[PDB]
Design a protein around this motif. Structure first.
Motif, mmCIF file in Angstrom:
data_model
loop_
_atom_site.group_PDB
_atom_site.id
_atom_site.type_symbol
_atom_site.label_atom_id
_atom_site.label_comp_id
_atom_site.label_asym_id
_atom_site.label_seq_id
_atom_site.Cartn_x
_atom_site.Cartn_y
_atom_site.Cartn_z
ATOM 1 N N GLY A 182 13.703 -8.505 108.186
ATOM 2 C CA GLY A 182 12.435 -8.902 108.795
ATOM 3 C C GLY A 182 12.563 -10.073 109.742
ATOM 4 N N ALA A 183 13.453 -11.015 109.472
ATOM 5 C CA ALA A 183 13.678 -12.190 110.319
ATOM 6 C C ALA A 183 14.294 -11.709 111.642
ATOM 7 C CB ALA A 183 14.542 -13.240 109.644
ATOM 8 N N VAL A 184 15.213 -10.759 111.511
ATOM 9 C CA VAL A 184 15.879 -10.192 112.714
ATOM 10 C C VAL A 184 14.919 -9.327 113.514
ATOM 11 C CG1 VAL A 184 17.775 -8.688 113.486
ATOM 12 C CG2 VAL A 184 18.092 -10.401 111.586
ATOM 13 N N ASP A 226 24.529 -10.643 112.182
ATOM 14 C CA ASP A 226 25.293 -9.640 112.924
ATOM 15 C C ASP A 226 26.072 -8.848 111.874
ATOM 16 O OD1 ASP A 226 27.326 -11.545 112.298
ATOM 17 O OD2 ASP A 226 28.395 -11.032 114.118
ATOM 18 N N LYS A 227 25.592 -8.903 110.642
ATOM 19 C CA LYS A 227 26.170 -8.244 109.501
ATOM 20 C C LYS A 227 25.163 -7.454 108.661
ATOM 21 C CE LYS A 227 29.477 -12.045 109.008
ATOM 22 N NZ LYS A 227 28.920 -12.717 110.203
ATOM 23 N N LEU A 228 24.062 -7.077 109.253
ATOM 24 C CA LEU A 228 22.965 -6.307 108.595
ATOM 25 C C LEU A 228 23.465 -4.996 107.986
ATOM 26 C CD1 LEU A 228 19.846 -6.633 110.933
ATOM 27 C CD2 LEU A 228 20.908 -8.430 109.554
ATOM 28 N N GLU A 229 24.622 -4.502 108.433
ATOM 29 C CA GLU A 229 25.109 -3.242 107.838
ATOM 30 C C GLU A 229 25.728 -3.575 106.475
ATOM 31 O OE1 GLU A 229 24.620 -0.280 108.397
ATOM 32 O OE2 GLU A 229 25.896 0.889 107.089
ATOM 33 N N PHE A 230 26.292 -4.775 106.345
ATOM 34 C CA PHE A 230 26.901 -5.089 105.033
ATOM 35 C C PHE A 230 25.753 -5.365 104.024
ATOM 36 C CE2 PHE A 230 28.972 -7.738 101.750
ATOM 37 C CZ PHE A 230 27.970 -8.698 101.579
ATOM 38 N N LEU A 231 24.666 -5.813 104.523
ATOM 39 C CA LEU A 231 23.458 -6.144 103.774
ATOM 40 C C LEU A 231 22.740 -4.907 103.223
ATOM 41 C CD1 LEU A 231 21.348 -9.141 105.013
ATOM 42 C CD2 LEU A 231 23.310 -9.054 103.551
ATOM 43 N N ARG A 232 22.672 -3.869 104.020
ATOM 44 C CA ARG A 232 22.062 -2.591 103.776
ATOM 45 C C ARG A 232 22.771 -1.857 102.635
ATOM 46 N NH1 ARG A 232 21.763 2.645 104.629
ATOM 47 N NH2 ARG A 232 23.987 2.299 105.294
ATOM 48 N N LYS A 233 24.080 -1.853 102.647
ATOM 49 C CA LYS A 233 24.941 -1.236 101.647
ATOM 50 C C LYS A 233 24.849 -2.055 100.330
ATOM 51 C CE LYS A 233 28.722 0.552 104.387
ATOM 52 N NZ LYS A 233 29.915 0.067 105.159
ATOM 53 N N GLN A 274 16.118 0.024 103.054
ATOM 54 C CA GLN A 274 15.247 -0.183 104.232
ATOM 55 C C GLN A 274 15.932 0.517 105.418
ATOM 56 O OE1 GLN A 274 13.613 -3.755 107.001
ATOM 57 N NE2 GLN A 274 13.278 -4.017 104.788
ATOM 58 N N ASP A 275 15.082 1.089 106.248
ATOM 59 C CA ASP A 275 15.566 1.810 107.446
ATOM 60 C C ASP A 275 15.578 0.683 108.504
ATOM 61 O OD1 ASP A 275 16.540 3.686 109.381
ATOM 62 O OD2 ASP A 275 14.658 4.863 109.325
ATOM 63 N N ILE A 276 16.794 0.465 108.953
ATOM 64 C CA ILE A 276 17.048 -0.572 109.947
ATOM 65 C C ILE A 276 17.684 -0.004 111.188
ATOM 66 C CG2 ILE A 276 17.282 -2.243 107.980
ATOM 67 C CD1 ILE A 276 20.378 -2.441 109.167
ATOM 68 N N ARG A 336 23.815 -4.909 113.512
ATOM 69 C CA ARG A 336 24.228 -4.070 112.405
ATOM 70 C C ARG A 336 25.724 -3.861 112.307
ATOM 71 N NH1 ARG A 336 22.646 0.613 113.324
ATOM 72 N NH2 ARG A 336 21.284 0.745 115.184
ATOM 73 N N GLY A 337 26.382 -4.976 112.022
ATOM 74 C CA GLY A 337 27.828 -5.035 111.857
ATOM 75 C C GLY A 337 28.075 -5.029 110.342
ATOM 76 N N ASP A 338 29.305 -4.731 109.995
ATOM 77 C CA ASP A 338 29.713 -4.680 108.580
ATOM 78 C C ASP A 338 30.360 -6.025 108.263
ATOM 79 O OD1 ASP A 338 30.057 -3.928 106.043
ATOM 80 O OD2 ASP A 338 30.838 -1.929 106.496
ATOM 81 N N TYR A 339 30.911 -6.091 107.066
ATOM 82 C CA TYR A 339 31.572 -7.351 106.640
ATOM 83 C C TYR A 339 32.319 -7.042 105.349
ATOM 84 C CZ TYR A 339 31.819 -12.168 104.752
ATOM 85 O OH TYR A 339 32.110 -13.322 104.073
ATOM 86 N N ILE A 340 33.391 -7.795 105.137
ATOM 87 C CA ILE A 340 34.234 -7.656 103.957
ATOM 88 C C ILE A 340 34.839 -9.014 103.603
ATOM 89 C CG2 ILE A 340 35.884 -6.381 105.549
ATOM 90 C CD1 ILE A 340 37.489 -5.615 103.029
ATOM 91 N N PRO A 341 34.245 -9.588 102.551
ATOM 92 C CA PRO A 341 34.667 -10.881 102.058
ATOM 93 C C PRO A 341 36.059 -10.929 101.467
ATOM 94 C CG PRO A 341 33.060 -9.947 100.557
ATOM 95 C CD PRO A 341 33.119 -9.033 101.780
#
Length: 137
Positions: free
Chosen positions: A28-30, A61-68, A90-92, A100-105
């Motif tokens: 929502g902020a994005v 810039d990591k909303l895809e990692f958030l979605r998963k 949520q449909d983003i 909508r980038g991914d991420y891997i800690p």
């Protein structure tokens, strides 16, 4: 709001519920930012996962990692027998591909995140439960 990097399946019932409830607010902020004409280029997004001050912007810039992760927070809430009324991711797809980038800690990023949860707990552990049990001393 706060985002964790730990196995949702190891999250104290209280941490599981709060994250569940908070993570989505990043979407929502994005949406808001993008409606004021902001793009990824307009934000100070740290190269490395942090806790303080630019914690949430770090995930912009990591909303895809958030979605998963949202998917995982819902699955863990149902698994525990929590009555959550929002069981759908949520449909983003409406947000520009750029955020909508991914991420891997890295295990060192995760360790940062574990210690913050861990010290919240130890503050007053009678307040935290795991599958509704008080295993925290």
């Amino acid at each position: 709001t706060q985002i964790n990097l730990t196995l949702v399946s190891e999250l104290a019932d209280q941490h599981l519920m709060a994250e569940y409830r908070e993570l989505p607010r990043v979407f929502g902020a994005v949406r808001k930012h993008v409606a004021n004409g902001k793009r990824v280029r307009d934000f100070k997004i740290s190269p490395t996962f942090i806790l303080g001050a630019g914690h949430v912007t770090f995930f912009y810039d990591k909303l895809e990692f958030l979605r998963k992760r949202q998917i995982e927070l819902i699955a863990e809430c149902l698994k525990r027998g929590f009555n959550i009324k929002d069981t759908t991711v949520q449909d983003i797809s409406d947000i520009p591909q750029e955020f909508r980038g991914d991420y891997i800690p890295h295990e060192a990023s995760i360790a940062i995140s574990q210690a913050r949860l861990d010290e919240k707990i130890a503050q007053r552990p009678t307040w935290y439960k795991y599958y509704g049990k008080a295993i925290y001393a």
